[PDB]
Write a protein that binds this DNA or RNA. Structure first.
Ligand SMILES: Cc1cn([C@H]2C[C@H](N=[N+]=[N-])[C@@H](COP(=O)(O)OP(=O)(O)OP(=O)(O)O)O2)c(=O)[nH]c1=O
Ligand SMILES: [Mg+2]
Lengths: 555, 412
DNA sequence: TGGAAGGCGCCCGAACAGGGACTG
DNA sequence: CAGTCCCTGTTCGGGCGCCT
């Protein structure tokens, strides 16, 4: 007979499937010492059990040193059991941000001792846990054990732990409505407007509550000592920051090197304003080996340099004041790069961040602005539960012209113009009506599916004409090309009639940037004109000039 | 203490697993409170990570309401109960409802809480309540009774409903009554006062059977169509006739009678767009017979109950929105325009939301089904804001389109 | 040594999906 | 017409970051 601490959670395998039989690792005796040591100490407490061979399941085992500690941590690789274990619904829906925390008069941070081990496994499930403990020689077999609790490395541990824990803390929290407990895994942040004395009373009270359930709270706990280390941050009475970021120094960079760098800088960008990852990421595109070495461009070198300069000076965030508004301001950084700061009091940031994503083959600054406002709204709604008031480097008429004219539903929430350049604009505008006195170019192009050879050309009301031979092209490309030609050869005001739906749709959305070089040149020309009217007719209807230039470009 | 009707998912199919989306603080509070009181009443009960299934949840205020309503997005569940609520326990559709001079929609959904639910099913009603800033992990629940917005609910409670209704169906022999999910649609040719009164009677009548009703008034006989129309000009430029032929050419996949030959003729040279072209006899005539064809019905379009409805919307600018509901391409069961809805001239996403609800509502009245929407919006743009504007207790299916307007077919 | 998990984020490319035009 | 090809968009899985 064992004993029962707290309510268990039912488990199953993937129906009509059976457990973990695989051989153990050739583990070095060095670890095996540290292993059998605390291993043996387990059984005393009811964490493990010796098991008759009636249990036909075997799973590998190892351990890694707890970082920043002399102590050792035990890890059982279950991958083969995981594959076959029933699916859960994770209850951990994300990570808490320091910038979301309100100011608390007094604050404690306490970790539970041996957390997964304080949680009863499922009676009927335990059997599947079977693993074997190594020896100094291969002669001694070592005992086989079935967990009575949640193993580190299963796929069901975290969800059950977090769930049970919530159930336990539930009753305390109802009794004390004015305490904040941020529960992440076993990490507890408790804060209150209580006086440090009354508060510590309460902390102790809680420790007792967690005791009734078998949950130890060692002196691993931060008591009086801002800053508290919490979720990779330092928490101070009025401010917070990330724990310091080390950027690798390597003289010669692998692919893995640039990955670490980039992810480090992405971690940094939640606080340090203006971090840019664009050019360093360009280095990783279409590469095979994480190990492979690659040289730094004069581009990514500049970037990394200025990013290092950003990191050099210490910065910090503040906390959230539910009485005051939220404000998000956005800066355009060039090459589809955007940075933003969310704050309440000017110049004191809650948090920062970046939007770099290139979405679409053809896009513009206005679209990317809308994209960032959405990224940031969603982020805000997660952290503060509300949408920030927005400060945007786009004139109020620019935005009005875009959203009213665009054929798609588009919107930005309450926002005001901030005059910080570079401003977001629309670089050209298509006329809504044909231009009187402007030459009219009927354009077409065609291409041969087999030859990949094609023509692109035009005819005009004024008699002007052209046809250009093309190589290794496609129908789409030739239609775009015909438009490009009409633009090059035309005055500052021009009427262009295409029958291309594809081309017309690309250009009508007023792109300022394209993956396509031909579209970029078209864009470049559109920006130079005073008036462009683009019109569409159906092909093969015997229309006007469209028929004539259709002739010219099949020939 | 009632007999729980068993329920199974469609053959060879598994329950919904759908991530909860971030909620605003006000919606999280409204839900925390709604769910607390829903628990102490035994309507739902907490559960744990053991149960693999999840449905998204959120809250709304009905039009003019001010009180929060819990709303579950069961679309993914409903898709997997489809057998049940189409083939077995489903409801017949009152072709007269749409003809009635007035129709009120009532929320009878509270009734569904009365009946209990098959116990083997509750594993599938799983829904997580999120916390602000992930302070807490998700508070999971599941339903012990008939959920609001599940399609099995109005079916299972159908016998109870019909019984509670029968007295008033007998008392008011000619007033048509339809049930679509959490709503009861009720309509009459009575004058406004008589109608409103009779609704109140249906209310009390619902009360002594133990139900509340936290009313929307439609007028299906006001509902009009939006025909394709050609322009009227005293002079025509080359551009004008090009745009016209493009339009008529596209219109020809609908009305096959449409002819472009005589109008095409006018365009024969290589001419400047702004140049005026006067109209020939036979083009004036072709244009006439076209205008006349566009007056007709499309031949051979009828509603097939076996088929899905599809709804398309186009943003026409300046507040206007056009739509078409159809089953097969180009055979349109209906066409329409909305103007000066809420958010006109200010917020597109709100107007699209209003349009999607109005269109859905007409489809429910007319065919007793919801359409699948093709929405002129970017996925992120819609998924970020739609809940803020949502006033309705159902949630139709949608997908997102990019279709630039090379021609203006549906609105001048 | 080399090795486990769950959660969130980024950036990439490789896979699948689906509209439009041209062709057998 | 169905059967390709072009093109452009989404989704997914894999690497890094960070927490436990
Ligand atoms: C760091 C880390 C944590 N976990 C989980 C499992 C652990 N539960 N247990 N036992 C929790 C908490 O780990 P942790 O809080 O870091 O330490 P713990 O095991 O609880 O004992 P302590 O040092 O005396 O405080 O996170 C993990 O599965 N893998 C990891 O690399
Ligand atoms: Mg711990």
């Amino acid at each position: 007979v064992p004993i029962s601490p707290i309510e268990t959670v039912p488990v199953k395998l993937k129906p009509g499937m059976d457990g973990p039989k695989v051989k153990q690792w050739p583990l070095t005796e060095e670890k095996i010492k540290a292993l059998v040591e605390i291993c043996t100490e387990m059984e005393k407490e009811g964490k493990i059990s010796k098991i008759g061979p009636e249990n036909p399941y075997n799973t590998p085992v190892f351990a890694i040193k707890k970082k920043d500690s002399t102590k050792w941590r035990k890890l059982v690789d279950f991958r083969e059991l995981n594959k076959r274990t029933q699916d859960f619904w994770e209850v951990q829906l994300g990570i808490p941000h320091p910038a979301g925390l309100k100011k608390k008069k007094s604050v404690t941070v306490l970790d539970v001792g041996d957390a997964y081990f304080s949680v009863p496994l499922d009676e009927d499930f335990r059997k599947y846990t079977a693993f074997t403990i190594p020896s100094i020689n291969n002669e001694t077999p070592g005992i086989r054990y079935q967990y009575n609790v949640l193993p580190q490395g299963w796929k069901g541990s975290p969800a059950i732990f977090q769930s049970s824990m919530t159930k336990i803390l539930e009753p305390f929290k109802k009794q004390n409505p004015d305490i904040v407990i941020y529960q992440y895994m076993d990490d507890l942040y408790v804060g209150s407007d209580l006086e440090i004395g009354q508060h510590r009373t309460k902390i102790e009270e809680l420790r007792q509550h967690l005791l009734r359930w078998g949950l130890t709270t060692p002196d691993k706990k931060h008591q009086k000592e801002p800053p508290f280390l919490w979720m990779g941050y330092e928490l101070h009475p009025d401010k917070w920051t990330v724990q310091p970021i080390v950027l690798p120094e390597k003289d010669s960079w692998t692919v893995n090197d640039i990955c670490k760098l980039v992810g480090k800088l992405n971690w940094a960008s939640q606080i340090y304003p203006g971090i840019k990852v664009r050019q360093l990421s360009k280095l990783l595109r279409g590469t095979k080996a994480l190990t492979e070495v690659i040289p730094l461009t004069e581009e990514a070198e500049l970037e990394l340099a200025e990013n290092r300069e950003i990191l050099k000076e210490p910065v910090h965030g503040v906390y959230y004041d539910p009485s005051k508004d939220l404000i998000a301001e956005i800066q355009k950084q060039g090459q589809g790069q955007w940075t933003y700061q969310i704050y309440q009091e000017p110049f004191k940031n809650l948090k920062t961040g970046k939007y770099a994503r290139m979405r679409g083959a053809h896009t513009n600054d206005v679209k990317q602005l809308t994209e960032a406002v959405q990224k940031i709204t969603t982020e805000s709604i997660v952290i503060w539960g509300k949408t920030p008031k927005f400060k945007l480097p786009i004139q109020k008429e620019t935005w009005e012209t875009w959203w009213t004219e665009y054929w798609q539903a588009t919107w930005i929430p309450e926002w005001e113009f901030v005059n910080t350049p570079p401003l977001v604009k629309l670089w050209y505008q298509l006329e809504k009506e044909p231009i009187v006195g402007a030459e009219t170019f009927y354009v077409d192009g065609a291409a041969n599916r087999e030859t990949k050879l094609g023509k692109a050309g035009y005819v005009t009301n004024k008699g002007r004409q052209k046809v250009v031979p093309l190589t290794n092209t496609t129908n789409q490309k030739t239609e775009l090309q015909a438009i490009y030609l009409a633009l090059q050869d035309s005055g500052l005001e021009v009427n262009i009639v295409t029958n291309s739906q594809y081309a017309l749709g690309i250009i009508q959305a007023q792109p300022d940037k394209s993956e396509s070089e031909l579209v970029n040149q078209i864009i470049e020309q559109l920006i130079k004109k005073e008036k462009v009217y683009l019109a569409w007719v159906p092909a093969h209807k015997g229309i006007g000039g469209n028929e004539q230039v259709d002739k010219l470009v099949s020939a | 203490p009632i007999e729980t009707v068993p329920v199974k998912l469609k053959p060879g199919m598994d329950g919904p697993k759908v991530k909860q989306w971030p909620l605003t603080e006000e919606k999280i509070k409204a839900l925390v409170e709604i769910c607390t009181e829903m628990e102490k009443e035994g309507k739902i009960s907490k559960i744990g990570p053991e149960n693999p299934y999840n449905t998204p949840v959120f809250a709304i205020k009905k039009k003019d309401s001010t009180k929060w309503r819990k709303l579950v997005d069961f679309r993914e569940l409903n898709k997997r109960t489809q057998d049940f609520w189409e083939v077995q326990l489903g409801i017949p559709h009152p072709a007269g409802l749409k003809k009635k001079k007035s129709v009120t929609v009532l929320d009878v959904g509270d009734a569904y809480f009365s009946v209990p639910l098959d116990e083997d099913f509750r594993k599938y009603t799983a829904f997580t309540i999120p916390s602000i800033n992930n302070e807490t992990p998700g508070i999971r629940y599941q339903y012990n009774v008939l959920p609001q917005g599940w399609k099995g609910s109005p079916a299972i409670f159908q016998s109870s409903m019909t019984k509670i209704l029968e007295p008033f169906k007998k008392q008011n022999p000619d007033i048509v009554i339809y049930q679509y999910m959490d709503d009861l649609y009720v309509g009459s040719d009575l004058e406004i006062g008589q109608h409103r009164t009779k609704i109140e009677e249906l209310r009390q009548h619902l009360l002594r059977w133990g139900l509340t009703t936290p009313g929307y008034e439609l007028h299906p006989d006001k509902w009009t169509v939006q025909p394709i129309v050609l322009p009227e000009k005293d002079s025509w430029t080359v551009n004008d006739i090009q745009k016209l032929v493009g339009k008529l050419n596209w219109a020809s996949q609908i009305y096959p009678g449409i002819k472009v030959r005589q109008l095409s003729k006018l365009l024969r040279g290589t001419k400047a767009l702004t140049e005026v072209i006067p109209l020939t006899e036979e083009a004036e005539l072709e244009l006439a017979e076209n205008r006349e064809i566009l007056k007709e019905p499309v031949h051979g379009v009828y509603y097939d109950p076996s088929k899905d409805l599809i709804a398309e919307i186009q943003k026409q600018g300046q507040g206007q929105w056009t739509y078409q509901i159809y089953q097969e391409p180009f055979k349109n069961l209906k066409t329409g325009k909305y103007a000066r809805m809420r958010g006109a001239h200010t917020n597109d996403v709100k107007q699209l939301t209003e349009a999607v609800q109005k269109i859905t509502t007409e489809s429910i009245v007319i065919w007793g089904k919801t359409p699948k929407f093709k929405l002129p919006i970017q996925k992120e743009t819609w998924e970020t804001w739609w809940t803020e504007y949502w006033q309705a207790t159902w949630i139709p299916e949608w997908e997102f389109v990019n279709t630039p307007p090379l021609v203006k077919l549906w609105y001048q």
